[model samples]
Target chain A: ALRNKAFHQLRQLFQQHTARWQHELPDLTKPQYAVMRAIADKPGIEQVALIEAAVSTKATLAEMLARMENRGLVRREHDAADKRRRFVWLTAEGEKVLAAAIPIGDSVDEEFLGRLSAEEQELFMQLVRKMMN
Target chain B: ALRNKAFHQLRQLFQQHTARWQHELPDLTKPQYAVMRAIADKPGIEQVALIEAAVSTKATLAEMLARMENRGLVRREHDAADKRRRFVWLTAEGEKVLAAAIPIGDSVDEEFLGRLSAEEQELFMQLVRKMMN
Candidate 1:
């Protein structure tokens, strides 16, 4: 019950924050931001791996990638050895957007965790890491 | 960065578990289940209030309620004094489905928090609650 309640609260918080961000960054969405970050973390990351790292399903990510590509935020390249294998990379413009968005995103995280003491934040992260494992 | 990673991991975990539940409960979705539980908590709750309690937006909840109503899991009734006001209630079938699904949903929460010690889980929940606030 605690987990469910916490999840619902998190969802609401994410939605509200995203709605606010929509006004400032109309072209980029929360999921697209995550995708861009994942691409920036590992340039030319394979699409399949991006799905895992970005926590997106194949269909959704495919559509998002297509939209981002059309907007010149990212580009997909085919593997020379295997044409069917596609890799993703953020464009220079995408990097600029990410640079601008990072601070805003970090602020959300800071506010979300601001209530906790420094030690408590570490402990909480440790617990989250354990769950992730 | 930590918060985003944690959020993505949580999303993946939720998605995977919900996928498995789909086999057992094809008719009810995670969101729909939340809506049903919220309605069951307060029979004849105002639809607007249910949206908040269930952590759903008006449009999405409206569509979901329509689908659930068509499936006979819930029914909406108009207020006698205010024709524009609508109330939601779970049908008998909805109650039965919810009873069966509770433990299944609980198992997901259990497995999600199972890696942590009980104390750590409590601390994790406290941090989550703080973020919610």
Candidate 2:
């Protein structure tokens, strides 16, 4: 259906442009950008909870965390009382990258919806929220 | 930024809900459905051309096409005039599946935007097309 076609096109455009922005930043990745913000929002959050809240697959979140940990962007600590439980925290570099990425991400969002007037953008967001409910 | 958060949530909602529908259909996959329709629309479109038109990465498009070909939903014929090039054609089964998938896909889309008034849906799509420019 053309409805599906249009939806896919919008999704792809958002994904592609967002990815291109992430590509332009040498130290920032999309996954890390998301993970960093999640950690910042809930410091010392458990790893499992982080994965759940992020709404991503365990494999991808784990792999991304591994990369971030390797690069000193995040740290994971196994709980002292529970061997299987781990907690995540963002480091200074993680905070810095997120700070840098926020503006880039904002710019992307703005342009992605920039064709609409401010009132139209509000109406669009209202529709999105309504549908989501 | 909050805008990024909202966009991610909307994207995830659309993705997760659509996936739930795809999960319900065992015989048809998202990629296969898309490829089948693409071939139907183009009728003997070239492999490279289809990939470009789909706006998907080569790896994903190639993999999906391989699976569709294996399932006998589509055929890739080497161009008689150019050995290195191939063209795609859909099978009868492909047409059947496209017909089957259409309503399922439409319902998913309808529910995804069901909260919007018919007029709002038109306006929403209009804004999306405008931004894509």
Candidate 3:
């Protein structure tokens, strides 16, 4: 029952996160959204490398990169040092979109945790952070 | 920072859980594994319904169900009354696989929570359950 509860809270967090992203930036896949979040954190990461960091396999990441590039969400270029590596950056449009989305994402995250009492919410977040580590 | 730590712990839990399940079962998609986990909890569940319960969509669920039925994990039958619903039951093989799997699942869960002090673990699990409700 504890596990069940934990599972539900986690799933609800995921669903709310997904819905907010979908509402804010309807064009991205969930995995792609995660990849973008990673890229936002690690500017100028290699395409394959970023995919490796996210859940997408190499081939799938390649395809998603193409689509993201086509949509102007990411800019992909060959690496200077390793010509084989495809380097990438979030495009201006992509940045604008995610910048606009930050507050929305933050709000959703807060709403998910805010259901707990303030101290409890702080503890829950701290625990979630600790567990991730 | 809190979110980052939380993310790490959750991912680690998943990695360890995945590793344990892979070590114990050796051959199951994570999605398939989750589906089996659900059916273990709800015996005599329908294939389509079970897929909906798990993270899979209907079309994908249909394919997964076929593969599962072929591998003798599930038995599929049409609805007697509705004629549209696809019913499912775990096979002897499925039961054996899950029966062999429970201790492994329980152990992974125990290890995951056991990291916390007893009081914290109980409180964490309680909060997780509460958040679900």
Candidate 4:
């Protein structure tokens, strides 16, 4: 029951945050921000690896990638060693956008946890990591 | 930052939990389950309110409501007072599915928080509610 309540709140948090971002960062979609962060961290990660890293459906991720490509945010490169494979790297614009996005995106979670005390925050992080593993 | 780490873990938790549920409840899509829960709670909730409550986009919700209706899980009724408006209600089968889904759905949050101690769980819930507001 506690977990159930937690899940509801989590869902609500995601909804509320996304709604706020629609206005706060209208240019960036949540998925794009997420994948862009991935691209920022791993400049040459292949499509399959990026898909595994992002919490997205394959179709949805593909669409996001296509849109990012079209918007000049990302570039797709054919793998020279493996002809069938493709790799992704962020463009200068993509990196700049992601840099701008970092603080705004960081605020979503910071404010979510800001209500908790320092000790509670540490515990929260530890527990989430445990569950993640 | 702290929020960045939290966001990373949150994304992973959702991905991990959903992957587990894919096998645990093969019949239900996450969106369908969320909508079904809404229909059960408000037997004749209007489509507009349901979308607001469920954190779904208009197009996504419309497609879901259509699919659920086709599967005989929900019924749609035109508002007599306003022909253009419609209301949604769950069918017997829909209710039955939701009843079964409750535990499975609840487990997702439970397992996520199960890593936390009892006291930490309370703190997490309280802080989440504060941030949600």
Candidate with maximal DockQ: 2
Summarize candidate 1's per-residue lDDT along A1-133 as a digit string, tens digits.
3234544554565555556557666777767888888899889989877776556678888888998999999999998999878999999999998999988766665666677787877676576557667
List the global CA lDDT of all models: 0.74, 0.72, 0.64, 0.75
Q: Considering summed lDDT, which 10 consecutive residues are worst modelled in model 2 chain B? A: B1-10
Evaluated at residue A18, the lDDT of candidate 4 is 69
Put down candidate 4 lDDT per residue, A13-106, tens digits, no spaces. 6667767777778988776887887777778878867765567777788888999999999999887888658789999998988899888877
Q: Residue A17's C-alpha lDDT in candidate 3?
A: 48
TM-score, per-candidate, Cα-based: 0.86, 0.84, 0.74, 0.80
lDDT of 3 by residue, A1-133 (tens): 2135343334444544455657765765556756777778878877776754455458888888788889898887786788879877899998886677656656655544556687876676566545444
Predicted structure with the largest TM-score when compared to the true one:
1
Decide which is better by DockQ, 2 or 3. Answer: 2
- Comparing 2 and 3 on TM-score, the stronger one: 2
Candidate scoring better on DockQ of 1 and 4: 4
Model 3 interface CAPRI class? acceptable
lDDT of 3 by residue, B1-133 (tens): 2124333234434555556556766766556756776677777677766754455568888888889889998786787898668777788898887677667656655555555676776677666555545
- The runs of at least 3 residues in candidate 4 whose Cα sits more than 4 Å from the true structure, single-residue gaps closed, are A1-4, A57-62, A108-111, B1-4, B46-48, B57-60, B107-110
TM-score of chain A of each: 0.79, 0.79, 0.68, 0.83
Worst 10 residues of 4 chain A by lDDT: A1-10
- Candidate 2 deviant stretches above 4 angstroms: A1-6, B1-6
TM-score of chain A of 2: 0.79
* lDDT: worst 10-residue window of model 4 chain B: B1-10
Better of 1 and 2 by DockQ: 2
